[PDB]
Design a protein around this ligand. Structure first.
Ligand SMILES: NC(=O)c1ccc[n+]([C@@H]2O[C@H](COP(=O)([O-])OP(=O)(O)OC[C@H]3O[C@@H](n4cnc5c(N)ncnc54)[C@H](OP(=O)(O)O)[C@@H]3O)[C@@H](O)[C@H]2O)c1
Ligand SMILES: NC(=O)c1ccc[n+]([C@@H]2O[C@H](COP(=O)([O-])OP(=O)(O)OC[C@H]3O[C@@H](n4cnc5c(N)ncnc54)[C@H](OP(=O)(O)O)[C@@H]3O)[C@@H](O)[C@H]2O)c1
Ligand SMILES: [Ca+2]
Ligand SMILES: [Ca+2]
Lengths: 338, 338
């Protein structure tokens, strides 16, 4: 069983708090969105204090490493974005990090406790107390940086030198690309210490098993129409039998897309070349594959390495990044029944 | 036949000229890249003057509408990027625009004359003179902007109000998305005056037939591995017969990908939702389809409408853009044998 005496709760900033800091696309829904989150944060904190747990409630600007150190456990109160924020400042594989979905009608909360615990949190505490749960260590990617002209200083997106460790780990993915959305990205890639291979594309995505359902899923999943087309082509071009139906096309589609998801516990990186350009002057290889190690040498003008959509690093011509998975970067999370 | 007496040649700026305005990723190749382009520009201009044609050679900063007006024809001397630059300032469907690939080992030049004419330009002039060619009018998209808080002023990326016409046409595509590469984009889309539909994704691409081979192709094409997987799934899940082989998988792949390309002359927009997010809180519809008309209402924080990778417009919450295809926006281009 597991009973912290000391807990920091990191709560997301709501849209309403943002504007506080009408037209027609806000206010009415926004204030109700704010009341729901606040009602649920209060339920979490009241429930913790009723178990005798000391609690510090902070917003993003006050969530710091000192407070993580003070705490026995971190609770992210918001959505998956709030889990990523919480994980960004936890580097100890023994420190539990737990997510509570505070607006389940608008937050997916895939990294969070099942939705029932949002308004039944004492039930979650008791399940923890009795050990009716399992530890889940989610693998994360660490980033090294070397080369010429490099700038290793992290930028917080929510407002010749040897390899040095960058101060965040990726729980979802590392995205590498030019800052301008229409500017093709140019680099060289070494996978598992293999040969260097020039790529031109709209960026690279390097995700964990946790991240396999996030950005990586939407880069790689095929539409049920595309599957329907591919199958119809296979009839014309060789009468590949079968009866294609509504049911079958969805099925085969779903089987393909599940192949893109893998276990959060497996220490492997799924890397995807995002929208590669082939034609007669460039040539690309595989679109995606698993690996333990990816090294990227920047050839970019004004590009960034973005960790979990939250922390950005400069990555221009001369910079060399290496990504791997290290056991000491595992993020300690919990699994409850729903 | 077709014999201009007055011609403006727009020549790209080379990398060397850029730096002029070594390590290891430049110079050696860069100066040879520069000599090749310059040698070919001189051949073009010498050939024109030898036909008695008056010629003004300009770089991007001096390419203006006045000079287009002066000219009987525009020649873009570079790659497809130089064709797009040239087309950006031509709004008259009667003014010929012709592209010459000045570095065919590094420029694809899909919008340009066949590579042989790069060093055999008098042959192209004579073919023009004798009418051994066909006019190709490439359809282009025009952009209207309305709404609240809008800013219709174009930004040149290479350094309550009613609908107003934006001053460029898209020869390849209009891209719409948030400026930050990791920030999901949010908007509502009306296709052919249909119902408004909320989307969340990494942007929208709205291309012409000319643009169908560019960005749109790499957003939508499927990998030969994915086809191989989809086919193998169809065996397991219903023994859909056939013998899958190296040959067959490439074939079916190629048939699918050709379905993404359409004629530059056809007045239809192929629009693609780029990396839509579905899950349990959002829901998307079709990934791509043809249309005559797409209206997009921005819900974005800090987004842009990017025309042919060269001209950018602000497009944040309150802005409403409508895209269509108008005959007076056709771009007059030529077709030569190779
Ligand atoms: N086109 C795309 O798919 C795209 C574009 C940009 C970013 N992203 C992803 O969004 C992450 C940043 O999340 P954010 O909440 O700060 O911004 P966000 O725009 O709210 O994220 C988009 C959605 O993905 C969900 N999500 C986040 N991490 C996930 C995971 N590991 N597995 C499954 N779903 C997940 C989020 O859930 P909640 O509703 O609980 O927030 C959200 O509904 C990034 O690391 C990136 O992976 C995806
Ligand atoms: N991931 C992607 O596929 C991606 C990302 C950004 C932009 N783009 C495309 O590139 C366009 C801007 O071109 P750029 O030359 O200024 O930058 P660029 O990075 O040099 O364009 C990428 C390549 O596409 C080729 N291309 C351009 N227009 C084409 C067309 N209509 N059909 C077939 N190929 C075409 C270019 O040919 P050249 O070698 O002759 O220049 C170039 O090789 C944009 O409108 C957009 O469509 C694609
Ligand atoms: Ca979120
Ligand atoms: Ca180019």
């Amino acid at each position: 069983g597991f009973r912290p005496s000391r807990v920091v709760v990191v709560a997301k900033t709501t849209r309403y708090e943002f504007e506080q800091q009408l037209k027609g696309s806000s206010y009415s829904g926004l204030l109700e969105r704010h009341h729901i989150h606040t009602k649920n944060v209060e339920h979490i904190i009241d429930s913790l204090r009723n178990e005798g747990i000391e609690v510090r409630l902070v917003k993003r600007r006050e969530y710091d490493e000192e407070t993580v150190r003070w705490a026995d456990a971190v609770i992210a109160a918001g959505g998956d974005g709030t889990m990523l924020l919480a994980a960004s400042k936890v580097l100890d594989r023994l420190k539990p990090v737990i997510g509570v979905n505070t607006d389940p009608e608008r937050s997916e909360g895939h990294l969070c406790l099942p939705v029932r615990y949002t308004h039944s949190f004492p039930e979650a505490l008791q399940k923890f107390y009795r050990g009716e749960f399992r530890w889940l260590w989610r693998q994360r990617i660490r980033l090294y940086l070397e080369g010429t002209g490099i700038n290793p200083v992290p930028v917080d997106l929510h407002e010749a030198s040897g390899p040095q460790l960058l101060p965040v780990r990726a729980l979802n993915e590392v995205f590498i690309g030019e800052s301008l959305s229409s500017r093709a990205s140019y680099y060289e890639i070494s996978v598992d210490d293999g040969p260097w291979e020039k790529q031109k594309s709209s960026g690279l995505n390097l995700c964990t098993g946790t991240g396999s359902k996030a950005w990586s899923f939407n880069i790689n999943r095929v539409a049920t129409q595309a599957v329907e087309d591919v199958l119809n082509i296979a009839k014309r071009q060789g009468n590949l039998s079968l009866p294609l139906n509504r049911e079958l096309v969805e099925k085969v589609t779903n089987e393909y897309n599940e192949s893109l998801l893998y276990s959060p516990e497996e220490p492997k990186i799924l890397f995807s070349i995002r929208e590669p350009i082939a034609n007669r002057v460039f040539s690309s290889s595989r679109q995606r594959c698993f690996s333990s190690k990816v090294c990227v040498r920047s050839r970019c003008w004004d590009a960034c390495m973005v960790v979990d959509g939250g922390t950005s690093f400069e990555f221009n011509d001369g910079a060399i990044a290496s990504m791997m998975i290290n056991k000491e970067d595992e993020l300690r999370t919990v699994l409850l029944e729903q």
